[PDB]
């Protein structure tokens, strides 16, 4: 009927606040679990297809229903921690109460997505406090939970201008702790996906806050060991900023150079891959600023004994656009690239990359015939620089007898 409907709805929300045990006692309460399962199941179908039911009083009743079900302390990690473990190889440990949890998530989402949903009426209840406890949940081990949370926080970000600043500051805090204190968190990817979409939304003359956020938060996310878990979405966030404002490219490329892995190969491949995507958007003007430091690295990589590092580097040559930026800058780039791939032409343990360095050397001479083997001319300038060095230290030490 036209009304006692609104009373019966609230009544059922109440009954869905009864938490059930799925872990400690896994065989208990089968019947009543189903009752709850059915109770919120129908409440989805109810609010989904019908309309004009998100009335003023049901708001607090819903938010409270969510909180009591969703906001718990996460249990101890089910995975070993330590330097000898790759979090990629962690056994998927699932949230045992997913029977109910899914439908609370699915519900609160439809509750959000309704075109009859009134933000500045709900905002009394979805507050900073709610957001913070929602943000805590991203460290859940269950990927399905993280998935829902991603979408939920993404909506909340969209529909509450009041909360946008807070949400930005809070996830920043989460990262800082991850990068600088613990180096463990299960939900880095998901938070970055939200952030990716957020980066696109940003406004024309990029605001200082966000520039800082790229340089101080997103770049250092690069230094943590478990980069593979969230690198794609991290790389995306970075690339988007560069599309939004090209003047950011020197600092970001200089940063990636600063953080270059010296003892972690998969990360070396990861960086090489990310940098190429960056070069795929580089305005020539911004390219001239970073070529030399960039290629002093590529030199190191090309001569790397690690076939996956060498390969990925050498694969830069199959990029028409990069290859042309090399071409009309050949003056500067070639004397630094040449020694590297020359030392590795005489011989190599790996035949494939042997093939690739022969090809690479070919493409360089076709750019500007450079019979410039005053390569060994530098190998002497360096012998002399070392003799001046050792003869300087002599003077300093024999001046220790001092005043």
């Amino acid at each position: 009927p036209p009304a006692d409907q609104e009373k019966l709805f609230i009544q059922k929300l109440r009954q869905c606040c009864v938490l059930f045990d799925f872990v400690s006692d896994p065989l208990s309460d089968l019947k009543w679990k189903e009752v709850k399962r059915a109770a919120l199941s129908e409440m989805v179908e109810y609010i989904t297809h019908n309309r004009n039911v998100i009335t003023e009083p049901i708001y607090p009743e819903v938010v409270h229903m969510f909180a009591v079900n969703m906001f718990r302390t996460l249990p101890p990690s089910s995975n070993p921690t330590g330097a000898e473990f790759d979090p990629e190889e962690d056994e998927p440990t699932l949230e045992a109460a997913w029977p109910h949890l899914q439908l609370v998530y699915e519900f609160f989402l439809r509750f959000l997505e309704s075109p009859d949903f009134q933000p500045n009426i709900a905002k009394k209840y979805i507050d900073q406090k709610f957001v913070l406890q929602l943000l805590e949940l991203f460290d859940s081990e269950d990927p399905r939970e993280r998935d829902f949370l991603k979408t939920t926080l993404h909506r909340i970000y969209g529909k509450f201008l009041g909360l946008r600043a807070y949400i930005r500051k809070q996830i920043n805090n989460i990262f800082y702790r991850f990068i600088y204190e613990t180096e463990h968190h299960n939900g880095i990817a998901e938070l970055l996906e939200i952030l990716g979409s957020i980066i696109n939304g940003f406004a024309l003359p990029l605001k200082e806050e966000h520039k800082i956020f790229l340089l101080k938060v997103l770049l250092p996310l690069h230094k943590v060991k478990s980069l593979s878990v969230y690198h794609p979405q991290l790389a995306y966030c970075v690339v988007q900023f560069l599309e939004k404002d090209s003047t950011l490219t020197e600092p970001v490329v200089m940063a990636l150079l600063k953080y270059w892995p010296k003892t972690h190969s998969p990360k070396e491949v990861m960086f090489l891959n990310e940098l190429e995507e960056i070069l795929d958007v580089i305005e020539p003007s911004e390219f001239v600023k970073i070529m030399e430091p960039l290629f002093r690295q590529l030199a190191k990589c090309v001569s790397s004994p690690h076939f996956q590092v060498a390969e990925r580097a050498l694969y830069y040559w199959n990029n028409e656009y990069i290859m042309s930026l090399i071409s009309d800058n050949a003056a500067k780039i070639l004397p630094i690239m040449f020694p590297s791939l020359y030392r590795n032409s005489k011989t190599h343990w790996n035949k494939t990359i042997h093939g690739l360095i022969y090809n690479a050397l070919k493409l360089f001479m076709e750019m500007n015939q450079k019979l410039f083997d005053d390569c060994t001319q530098q190998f002497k300038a360096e012998k002399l620089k070392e003799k001046l060095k050792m003869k300087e230290r002599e003077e300093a030490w024999v001046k220790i007898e001092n005043l």
Binding site: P80, A83, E181, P261, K262, T263, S265, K267, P305
Partner: protein, 303 residues
């Protein structure tokens, strides 16, 4: 007749038993000494009758220590290791260098074969290369060890009867003499008999078949039975495949898989095993669990 060097070796070994790496110039010297003894060993090494035979180890030093607790100390009991000393564990440097160490001090007491992880390529995609890098600061020790892996015999023959190898059988191989005729002094090729021997797996599909690993072949009972009958072998003993009981019979007992890394990569939860061949070549297996395992790291962009 001076044993100045065996004092030096005894020290290196003692050090290694305390899970402490040797130095760059010590590994280099060690490998140099190791090469000269391995080079004179056959593609199919003749191994004397009482031995204890072991599967994969993959850098799990503390479990190797555990192995010796079950098996006996590394001079008093003879050992034969079927390769795979270096990858997924946290202590590949200490493990391979210890095992090589033992071989040069006691060439007669220990034999070490090549596994599929003793190779430049495999050692780069899995831990060892990065381990060497964070423990030494350069790629030299890696260069010395990989150069040294080319010299490891491919297969062993215990008492003309128990054929020992890392992988399994090869379609290009029908006899031991086919094996003796190979040139092993090289990187493990992507195809061919040398490769199959380090890569293949037995299975339940009674014939040659495509390996789910990108290399070697699968092979069923009938190959094993022919291969054994043709060579007068009572058993093929092999070691490249995780088994949850640490050891596994198959092919009407023509082959055994032995696997010596308990709870592999500290993830897999498997038992480990080794097999003792006594004076009269009777066998017995010993299973064992992983040994009782009793700041913020340096940034990976440091060096």
């Amino acid at each position: 007749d001076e044993k100045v060097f065996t004092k030096e070796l005894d020290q290196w070994i003692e050090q290694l038993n305390e899970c402490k790496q040797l130095s760059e110039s010590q590994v280099k010297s060690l490998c140099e000494k190791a090469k000269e003894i391995l080079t004179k060993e056959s593609n199919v090494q003749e191994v004397r009758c009482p031995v204890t035979v072991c599967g994969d180890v993959h850098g799990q030093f503390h479990d190797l220590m555990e192995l010796f607790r079950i098996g006996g100390k590394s001079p008093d009991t003879n050992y034969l290791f079927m390769g795979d000393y270096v990858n997924r564990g946290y202590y590949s440097v200490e493990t391979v260098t210890l095992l090589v160490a033992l071989k040069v001090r006691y060439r007669e007491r220990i034999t070490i074969l090549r596994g599929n992880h003793e190779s430049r390529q495999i050692t780069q995609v899995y831990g060892f290369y990065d381990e060497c890098l964070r423990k030494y600061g350069n790629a030299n020790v890696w260069k010395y060890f990989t150069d040294l892996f080319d010299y490891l015999p491919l297969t062993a023959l215990v008492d003309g009867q128990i054929f020992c190898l890392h992988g399994g059988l090869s379609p290009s191989i029908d006899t031991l003499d086919h094996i003796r005729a190979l040139d092993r002094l090289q990187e493990v090729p992507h195809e061919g008999p040398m490769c199959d021997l380090l890569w293949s797996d037995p299975d339940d599909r009674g014939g040659w078949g495509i390996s789910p690993r990108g290399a070697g072949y699968t092979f069923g009972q009938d190959i094993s039975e022919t291969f054994n009958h043709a060579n007068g072998l009572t058993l093929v003993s092999r070691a490249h495949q995780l088994v949850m009981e640490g050891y596994n019979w198959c092919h009407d007992r023509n082959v055994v898989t032995i696997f010596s890394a308990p709870n592999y990569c500290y993830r897999c939860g498997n038992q480990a095993a080794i097999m003792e061949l006594d004076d009269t070549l009777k066998y017995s297996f010993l299973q064992f669990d992983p040994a009782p395992r009793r700041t913020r790291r340096t940034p990976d962009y440091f060096l």
